[PDB]
Design a protein around this ligand. Structure first.
Ligand SMILES: Nc1nc2c(ncn2[C@@H]2O[C@H](COP(=O)(O)OP(=O)(O)OP(=O)(O)O)[C@@H](O)[C@H]2O)c(=O)[nH]1
Ligand SMILES: Nc1ncnc2c1ncn2[C@@H]1O[C@H](COP(=O)(O)OP(=O)(O)CP(=O)(O)O)[C@@H](O)[C@H]1O
Ligand SMILES: Nc1nc2c(ncn2[C@@H]2O[C@H](COP(=O)(O)OP(=O)(O)O)[C@@H](O)[C@H]2O)c(=O)[nH]1
Ligand SMILES: CC(=O)N1CCN(c2ccc(Cl)cc2)CC1
Ligand SMILES: CC(=O)N1CCN(c2ccc(Cl)cc2)CC1
Ligand SMILES: [Ca+2]
Ligand SMILES: [Ca+2]
Ligand SMILES: [Ca+2]
Ligand SMILES: [Mg+2]
Ligand SMILES: [Mg+2]
Ligand SMILES: [Mg+2]
Lengths: 438, 349, 54, 422
């Protein structure tokens, strides 16, 4: 058994972390007090779920997680929330004033003064691990902390844990659920400095989650709770292989091996299905072929883009529930004859498939209906370069007039870091085009 | 009040569409860089589709289908017809063609060429590329290949129709231009009005050197031909006159003898690529106007020559056709405050 | 259409389908960056205090 | 615990400041004696932002009342909520400033400023984490204008990295007290260009027209004008004082509103302005963006919005709000700059102001504000070209050179606005 340490940075990372660990507890049968009746080894064990939970002598199952935010209002929801008893106080780290949506403030001004503390707390979790695999880092692109402090943390993690994999769950900025205008700056600044330090990153576009919540869950104006509960399902689907018995994606190193042939191109596209409203009278349970076909509909993707006009480099199908391999292949063949699936010529046109029999778990009293089978597709497509183009264009519009630049310079950042980070994103866009277009 | 942007100042068609939108007093034009728009009249090349459909609350529509180039590129079309199960097997309406680079079909072309030479058959081919105004018609294979190596872009060699239907008097070639509009729902609308672009020179099958009587392009006829505008004004014959001619000469009608095949060819091409370009379940909507170019041989069989993705229109038809665009393509998505000019080629989606 | 490496257990199974065959900055350097930004903040503030002093 | 320290200086500053504390005290359930008597916990969740907690569950505003003459502050101490203020936070002199910027900034004010800072220091030292400062004052008088800007300069010297915001009343010949107002306003504007992060420009002319034309007040009084200012000040601080999906301190708000350091002068607006009728969301959005509802006396159709923020208060359809906001922009995008993507932001708050089912507050960073500075600069130059009334200022130690510099500084500011309007 090899441990995974989860790190949640900023409001988005913390609240998504809160929603994931709630889901993990419900999936592994862990009560809010930390007790786990089905765990017959008390205060010890090397089970699959122990990759994410440690155990006290009193039988408490403690998440291998650290929560970091430069202001306390969001983490206090954890300290006093339903699962307050799961965490030791040292695992929840809060400053007193945030980065004000200013990457420079989160990375340099405030990051410089809190980084060593965070490393020390993370070190204490590493010292409980006999074979640490690596870290899962949750954060937003747009936040001053999620963007600025994360990139500093990622640089220091590469120094202190060189041989350890690092995976990201990144929230891509969407105007429909944001009141900030500088997020394009923070996104590009953080991607540039984090690029060489992240082995695999799953971007989630709030625009996509928002539309899925309005369309499939009939939520007129989704909140962050609605968004985070949905996002935690996808995250759970991705991390399930590390927490349950299985043979596919059994350690973080396997995510790069199966999804990232080229290191810089490490942003797989995530697709989830089905998302059924709980208020529905009673939906017809979808079949393996149907939910599989849904994985190639743009409306079920975590990042809105058109994969029909890109190239696939890898592809993982992760099924949870009543699914047998016979039904998967039947659905696959059917889809290859109808869909536009263009693979890169230097990659086999195949799909790695994983099936977990335990069906998707849902938070009682949530918006998501209990389904008998669900799938999450992880595919590395050049089509996701659309998201970089969109974001890079917004950066260009504001940077041509130096709008808001003074806020970053005032915090000690040099203006040259803007163009340096932008030119790196231009090279990243060129990499995708060299792999995708003919 | 709907907003639209213009990003192709050279579109004669959408210059009039934009002129009509502003006339309704309910459409407002914005700077070409303003992202807050409902309709985009986009550029022909490198249209940034990836930035469409991400403005909150804005229903965004564009006048191009992403991926239609597969149909409107010479070499792309040839590959599509050969590699598409919906077409290659029974595509009896597309002249034998081969993609030739200066993968490549050099050897396969020669195999079919030697077959024709050995079998006394008419072995005349025409080489062309998308980078042309650069066309060559020849019955010798050596010239066709040496003409492509001197250049530097991909070319297609296809069988030259040695038995074209010749109009009388004059004994002259011609081609048929059909305008087709595909809206956001992927309905296929065929403009009731087509045009024959005629050659004002007598067709001479014993001299492929003088390309004025073989190339029916409106520019080549108005430039190198000495009988321009003799029979019809601007070497353009419209369906009313052409239909009457077919009744007097061949005792047939334009609908039966030709239009049935045109409609079938338009449906075949568009239905084939529908799954790959449809915006039905996309975050933005697409429509596009297409210019299908056909040839008619002396057996009254219709041949598809190419499909233009950025076509122009006949001077006399701009008013009616452009109004039809606004009617079915734009106002259908953005309504304002007949006897349609189009023919709906129904089909299964 | 070939299935390979089928692994089965009580909680699920996994396999691979093939449709077609194919054809860092040190700790020191991070300190310098952080302290350089801090220095530029010190300088800019000194210029403000100098301005206010005038 | 993101505390804000409020300062009100001069006659105007203290009268508007008094009405502001009267309004929000009502919203937060605080009675004139400082005791809480509301019915909702939302009233106390962020109560420490503007109020200190004393013994016996008393809430005392974190406010400092400054003036060079006792008159106005004697009125506050005897007014409705006068008892609620901290006795030690009344700092005043006897000489007055004679509507003279030089007296408030250099002579009379300089003698009083150190004791004001002693009280500011005292309030800041008891702050868990100081968010920043806000100052209410006018620019056309002597104390609020001249001493107010001196205070800002000395606050910035001691708290260089704290946000400094002002609600600044701009003069107008229509509602003028003295002819030297253009002098005082121009001298102050230069101070604000340098030392404030955000300034809400409140134009007494706009307030007057709203009272005469829209509100149908035959003879408006300062009290009437101040009712609009109080209502506006409560709206802009609603997201700071109540819980909601906003959650943003002064610096985060300034970061997203100010693209260039010198262009930080906002045009505020309020709505609504046949009084019991229910106002639909379309009526809130149309009015709020209407010029006849703004207090900058500037026609937004003369410039372009760099950034726009809107706060809706009340139980309403947030879906319908977005539909109306996304309708105003997408139906008038010619007045928004296209090189700041998504520069129109909206926020909702469930707690409506007193006696209103719902309301909307508007905060605009518009280049049209240059017209307000053009009017001031024109009146300034007309007098300065003849050195009219200058002796009131050179008699206090000021030289003509300082006037020339202020003239140039504001004309630069106008030129800076004009280039971004193109
Ligand atoms: N999906 C999702 N997005 C969130 C959530 N919270 C914030 N965001 C998004 O994150 C971006 C704002 O950054 P934050 O994470 O809130 O800021 P931060 O990381 O705490 O950094 P600070 O500036 O110091 O507050 C916006 O795009 C929000 O839409 C959340 O709980 N779920
Ligand atoms: N295989 C073939 N047989 C007979 N004629 C042919 C032919 N290929 C091309 N032509 C002649 O060439 C003309 C059209 O050429 P083509 O369309 O390939 O070039 P082009 O695309 O630059 C003109 P446009 O796009 O405007 O139709 C027709 O008038 C036709 O007479
Ligand atoms: N809106 C409003 N404006 C005021 C008020 N009192 C004064 N003014 C304006 O402020 C200017 C006079 O400045 P004042 O505050 O009286 O001078 P100070 O006491 O020296 O700071 C003039 O432009 C007046 O129109 C008030 O109560 N409300
Ligand atoms: C004695 C005692 O209470 N404990 C348990 C909690 N501890 C802890 C420290 C850091 C981190 Cl990240 C996690 C947990 C310290 C030891
Ligand atoms: C105190 C201050 O700086 N301001 C200006 C910006 N504000 C704002 C309101 C709504 C939204 Cl969505 C965004 C920003 C509130 C008041
Ligand atoms: Ca155990
Ligand atoms: Ca590394
Ligand atoms: Ca004295
Ligand atoms: Mg935060
Ligand atoms: Mg062509
Ligand atoms: Mg006065």
């Amino acid at each position: 058994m090899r441990e995974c340490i989860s790190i949640h940075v900023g409001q988005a990372g913390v609240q998504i972390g809160n929603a994931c660990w709630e889901l993990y507890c419900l999936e592994h049968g862990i009560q809010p007090d930390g007790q786990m009746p089905s765990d017959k080894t008390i205060g010890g064990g090397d089970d699959s779920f122990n990759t994410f939970f440690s155990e006290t002598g009193a039988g408490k199952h403690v998440p291998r997680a650290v929560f970091v935010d430069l202001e306390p209002t969001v983490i206090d929801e954890v300290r006093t929330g339903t699962y307050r008893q799961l965490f030791h106080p040292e695992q929840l780290i809060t400053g007193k004033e945030d980065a004000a949506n200013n990457y420079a403030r989160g990375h340099y001004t405030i990051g410089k003064e809190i980084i060593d503390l965070v490393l020390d707390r993370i070190r204490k979790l590493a010292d409980q691990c006999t074979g640490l695999q690596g870290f899962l880092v949750f954060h937003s692109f747009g936040g001053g902390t999620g963007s600025g402090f994360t990139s500093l943390l990622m640089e220091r993690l590469s120094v202190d844990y060189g041989k350890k994999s690092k995976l990201e769950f990144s929230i891509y900025p969407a105007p429909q659920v944001s009141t900030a205008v500088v997020e394009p700056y923070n996104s590009i600044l953080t991607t540039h400095t984090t690029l060489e330090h992240s082995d695999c990153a799953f971007m989630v576009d709030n625009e996509a989650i928002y539309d899925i919540c309005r369309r499939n869950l009939d939520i007129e104006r989704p909140t962050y709770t609605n968004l985070n509960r949905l996002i935690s399902q996808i995250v759970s689907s991705i991390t399930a292989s590390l927490r349950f018995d299985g043979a596919l994606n059994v350690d973080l190193t396997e995510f790069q091996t199966n999804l990232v042939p080229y290191p810089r191109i490490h942003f797989p596209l995530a697709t989830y299905a089905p998302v059924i409203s709980a208020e529905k009278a009673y939906h017809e349970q979808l079949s393996v072929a149907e939910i599989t076909n849904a994985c190639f509909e743009p409306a079920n993707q975590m990042v809105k883009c058109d994969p029909r006009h890109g190239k696939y480099m890898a592809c993982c199908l992760l099924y949870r529930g009543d699914v047998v391999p016979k039904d998967v292949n039947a659905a696959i063949a059917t889809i290859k004859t109808k869909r536009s699936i263009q693979f890169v010529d230097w990659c086999p046109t195949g799909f790695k498939v994983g099936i977990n029999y335990q069906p998707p778990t849902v938070v009682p009293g949530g918006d998501l209906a209990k389904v008998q089978r669900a799938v999450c597709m992880l595919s590395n497509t050049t089509a996701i370069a659309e998201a970089w183009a969109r974001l890079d264009h917004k950066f260009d519009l504001m940077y041509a007039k130096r709008a808001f630049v003074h806020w970053y310079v005032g915090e000690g950042m040099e203006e040259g870091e803007f163009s340096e980070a932008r030119e790196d994103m231009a090279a990243l866009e060129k990499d995708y085009e060299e792999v995708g277009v003919d | 009040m709907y907003t639209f942007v213009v990003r192709d100042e050279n579109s004669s068609v959408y210059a009039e569409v934009s002129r009509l939108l502003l006339a309704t007093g309910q459409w407002k034009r914005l700077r070409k860089d303003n992202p807050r728009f409902n309709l985009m009249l986009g550029e022909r090349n490198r249209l940034p589709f990836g930035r469409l459909g991400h403005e909150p609350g804005l229903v965004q529509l564009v006048n191009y289908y992403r991926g239609a180039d597969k149909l409107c590129r010479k070499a792309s079309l040839v590959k599509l017809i050969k590699t598409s199960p919906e077409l290659s097997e029974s595509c009896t309406w597309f002249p034998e063609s081969y993609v030739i680079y200066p993968t490549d079909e050099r050897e396969v072309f020669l195999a079919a060429y030697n077959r024709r030479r050995e079998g006394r058959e008419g072995n005349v081919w025409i080489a062309k590329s998308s980078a042309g105004a650069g066309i060559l018609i020849s019955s010798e294979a050596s010239e066709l290949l040496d003409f492509i190596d001197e250049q530097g872009q991909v070319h297609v060699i296809q069988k030259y129709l040695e038995k074209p239907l010749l109009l009388e008097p004059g004994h002259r070639k011609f081609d048929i231009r059909s305008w087709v509009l595909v809206d956001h729902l992927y309905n296929i609308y065929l403009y009731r009005e087509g045009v024959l672009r005629t050659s004002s020179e007598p067709y001479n099958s014993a001299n492929f050197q003088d390309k004025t009587c073989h190339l029916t392009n409106h520019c080549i006829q108005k430039e190198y031909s000495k009988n321009y505008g003799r029979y019809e004004e601007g070497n353009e014959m419209f369906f009313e006159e052409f239909n009457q001619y077919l009744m007097d000469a061949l005792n047939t009608t334009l609908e039966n003898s030709i239009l049935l095949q045109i409609k079938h060819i338009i449906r075949s091409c568009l239905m084939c690529i529908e799954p790959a370009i449809s915006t039905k379940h996309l975050h933005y909507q697409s429509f596009q106007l297409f210019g299908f170019d056909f040839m008619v041989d002396e057996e009254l069989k219709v041949w598809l020559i190419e499909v233009n993705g950025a076509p122009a229109c006949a001077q006399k038809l701009y008013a009616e056709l452009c109004q039809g665009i606004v009617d079915v393509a734009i106002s259908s998505v953005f309504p304002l405050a007949p006897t349609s000019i189009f023919i709906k080629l129904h089909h299964h989606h | 259409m070939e299935v390979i490496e089928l692994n089965k257990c009580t909680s699920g199974q996994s396999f691979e389908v093939i449709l077609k065959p194919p054809s860092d900055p040190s700790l020191e350097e991070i300190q310098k960056k952080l302290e350089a930004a801090e220095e530029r903040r010190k300088y800019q503030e000194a210029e403000l205090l100098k301005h206010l002093a005038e | 615990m993101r505390e804000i320290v409020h300062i009100q200086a001069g006659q105007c500053g203290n009268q508007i400041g008094a009405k502001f504390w009267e309004v929000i005290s009502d919203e937060h359930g605080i009675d004139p004696t400082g005791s809480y008597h509301g019915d909702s916990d939302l009233q106390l969740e962020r109560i420490n932002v503007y109020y200190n907690e004393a013994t016996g569950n008393k809430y005392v505003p974190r406010a400092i009342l400054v003036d060079l003459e006792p008159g106005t502050m004697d009125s506050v101490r005897s007014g409705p909520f006068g008892q609620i203020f901290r006795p030690d936070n009344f700092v005043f002199g006897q000489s007055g400033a004679g509507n003279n910027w030089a007296k408030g900034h250099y002579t009379e004010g300089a003698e009083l400023v150190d004791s004001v800072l002693d009280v500011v220091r005292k309030e800041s030292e008891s702050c868990d984490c100081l968010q920043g400062f806000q100052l209410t004052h006018s620019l056309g008088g002597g104390t609020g204008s001249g001493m107010g800007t001196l205070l800002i300069s000395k606050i910035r010297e001691e708290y260089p990295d704290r946000i400094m915001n002002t609600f600044s009343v701009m003069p107008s010949p229509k509602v003028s007290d003295t002819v030297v107002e253009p002098y005082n306003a121009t001298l102050s504007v230069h101070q604000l260009v340098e030392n404030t992060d955000e300034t809400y420009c409140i134009d007494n002319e706009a307030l007057y027209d709203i009272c005469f034309r829209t509100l149908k007040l035959t003879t408006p009084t300062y009290g009437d004008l101040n009712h609009l200012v109080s209502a506006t000040m409560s709206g802009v601080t609603t997201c700071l004082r109540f819980p909601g999906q906003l959650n943003a301190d002064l610096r985060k708000l300034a970061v997203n509103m100010v693209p260039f350091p010198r262009l930080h002068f906002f045009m505020p607006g309020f709505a609504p302005l046949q009084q019991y009728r229910a106002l639909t969301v379309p009526e809130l959005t149309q009015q709020m963006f209407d010029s006849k509802n703004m207090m900058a006396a500037c026609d937004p159709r003369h410039g372009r919005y760099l950034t726009v923020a809107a706060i809706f208060r009340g139980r309403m359809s947030m879906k319908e709000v977005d539909e109306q906001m996304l309708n105003v922009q997408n139906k008038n995008s010619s007045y928004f700059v296209e090189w700041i993507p998504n520069n129109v932001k909206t926020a909702v708050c469930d707690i409506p102001p007193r006696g209103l089912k719902m309301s909307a507050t508007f905060i605009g960073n518009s280049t049209a504000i240059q017209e307000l500075f053009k009017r001031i600069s024109e009146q300034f130059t007309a007098m300065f070209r003849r050195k009219a009334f200058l002796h009131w200022y050179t008699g206090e130690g000021m030289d003509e050179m300082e006037f020339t510099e202020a003239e140039s500084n504001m004309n630069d500011l106008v030129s800076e606005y004009q280039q971004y309007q193109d």
